[PDB]
Design an enzyme around this catalytic site. Structure first.
Site, short mmCIF file in Angstrom:
data_model
loop_
_atom_site.label_atom_id
_atom_site.label_comp_id
_atom_site.label_asym_id
_atom_site.label_seq_id
_atom_site.Cartn_x
_atom_site.Cartn_y
_atom_site.Cartn_z
N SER A 183 -3.92 6.34 4.69
CA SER A 183 -4.51 6.58 6.00
C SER A 183 -4.72 5.31 6.79
O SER A 183 -4.52 5.31 8.01
CB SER A 183 -5.84 7.34 5.90
OG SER A 183 -6.86 6.51 5.37
N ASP A 204 10.75 7.74 -2.19
CA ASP A 204 10.71 8.06 -3.62
C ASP A 204 11.33 9.41 -3.90
O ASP A 204 11.56 10.19 -2.99
CB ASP A 204 9.29 7.93 -4.22
CG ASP A 204 8.29 8.94 -3.68
OD1 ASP A 204 8.64 10.13 -3.54
OD2 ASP A 204 7.11 8.54 -3.47
N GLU A 245 0.81 -1.22 0.00
CA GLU A 245 0.00 0.00 0.00
C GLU A 245 0.84 1.28 0.00
O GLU A 245 0.57 2.18 -0.77
CB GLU A 245 -0.99 0.03 1.19
CG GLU A 245 -1.81 1.33 1.32
CD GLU A 245 -2.65 1.66 0.06
OE1 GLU A 245 -3.02 2.86 -0.13
OE2 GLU A 245 -2.96 0.73 -0.71
C1 LIG Z 1 -2.01 14.31 -3.90
N1 LIG Z 1 -1.29 13.04 -4.26
C2 LIG Z 1 -0.65 13.02 -5.59
C3 LIG Z 1 0.45 14.02 -5.63
C4 LIG Z 1 0.14 15.27 -6.14
C5 LIG Z 1 1.12 16.27 -6.23
C6 LIG Z 1 2.41 16.02 -5.79
C7 LIG Z 1 2.71 14.77 -5.26
C8 LIG Z 1 1.75 13.77 -5.20
N2 LIG Z 1 2.20 12.70 -4.54
C9 LIG Z 1 1.61 12.12 -3.51
O1 LIG Z 1 0.57 12.46 -3.06
C10 LIG Z 1 2.35 11.01 -2.85
C11 LIG Z 1 1.80 10.39 -1.74
C12 LIG Z 1 2.53 9.38 -1.16
C13 LIG Z 1 2.04 8.76 -0.03
C14 LIG Z 1 2.78 7.74 0.54
C15 LIG Z 1 4.03 7.34 0.02
C16 LIG Z 1 4.57 7.95 -1.11
C17 LIG Z 1 3.85 8.97 -1.72
N3 LIG Z 1 4.36 9.56 -2.80
C18 LIG Z 1 3.67 10.52 -3.38
O2 LIG Z 1 4.20 11.05 -4.36
C19 LIG Z 1 -2.11 11.82 -4.14
C20 LIG Z 1 -2.52 11.54 -2.69
C21 LIG Z 1 -3.17 10.17 -2.57
C22 LIG Z 1 -4.31 9.97 -3.59
C23 LIG Z 1 -3.93 10.42 -5.01
C24 LIG Z 1 -3.38 11.84 -4.98
#
Ligand SMILES: CN(Cc1ccccc1NC(=O)c1cc2ccccc2[nH]c1=O)C1CCCCC1
Length: 198
Positions: A99, A68, A37
């Site tokens: 979450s 990452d 996840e």
């Molecule tokens: C808002 N983000 C996308 C997003 C938009 C703009 C910039 C970076 C991101 N990235 C992220 O949200 C993002 C979340 C994340 C969470 C856990 C582990 C690694 C992760 N790596 C990521 O890159 C997601 C959140 C979860 C659902 C889809 C949208």
């Protein structure tokens, strides 16, 4: 406000019936699903063109971390809930979702590298110790999630097996052609690297 209430409400519901969200809690399947996840979140960022490499490390204190080099979760405060967008992602149901991993982690460290800065937030059972804070400067971007599975929730198999992560991570590199994923076991020096170029 009352949003702190609904967050706790949903967290309660997850810790109450964990198998329904994460998988079986008594045979290790759910425990390891916690990792995939977090990783699936990073893979999404790689499928959007921003992440290249993902680094999964099994630590000596029985926590796992996922790193990452994507954009970094947005750190700006959300209008409806008055906390960083990042904190909403980590705490709100359907923001699976990470979450769930947060709710079922005895502890969770978040570290974001973005627009020249490093931000940090610590959680306990999904509950932030404090608002996302800026801790320092940096010229790289990315998100790092390190979690310690909740010992209340997971029974019998409470330690991660390298071979289960290794197998599934190879598979996930194959399923998302182009991503590089690295697996390090700090307990015994085990290491591997997965990458299918198309
Ligand atoms: C808002 N983000 C996308 C997003 C938009 C703009 C910039 C970076 C991101 N990235 C992220 O949200 C993002 C979340 C994340 C969470 C856990 C582990 C690694 C992760 N790596 C990521 O890159 C997601 C959140 C979860 C659902 C889809 C949208």
């Amino acid at each position: 406000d009352s949003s702190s209430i609904k967050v706790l409400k949903g967290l309660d519901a997850v810790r109450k019936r964990p198998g329904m969200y994460i998988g079986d809690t008594d045979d290790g399947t759910g425990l390891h699903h916690m990792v995939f996840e977090v990783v699936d979140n990073a893979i999404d960022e790689a499928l959007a063109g921003h992440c290249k490499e993902i680094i999964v490390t099994i630590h000596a204190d029985n926590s796992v971390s996922v790193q990452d080099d994507g954009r970094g979760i947005p750190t700006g405060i959300h209008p409806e809930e008055g906390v960083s967008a990042a904190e909403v992602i980590m705490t709100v149901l359907h923001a699976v979702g990470v979450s769930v991993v947060n709710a079922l982690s005895q502890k969770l460290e978040l570290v974001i590298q973005r627009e020249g800065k490093i931000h940090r937030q610590i959680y306990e059972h999904g509950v932030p110790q404090a608002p996302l804070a800026v801790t320092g400067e940096t010229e790289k971007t990315g998100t790092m999630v390190r979690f310690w599975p909740s010992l209340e929730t997971f029974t019998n198999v409470t330690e991660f097996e390298y071979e289960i992560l290794a197998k599934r991570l190879r598979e996930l590199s194959f399923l998302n052609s182009g991503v590089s994923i690295r697996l390090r076991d700090k307990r015994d020096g085990k290491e591997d690297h997965f990458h299918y170029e198309g």
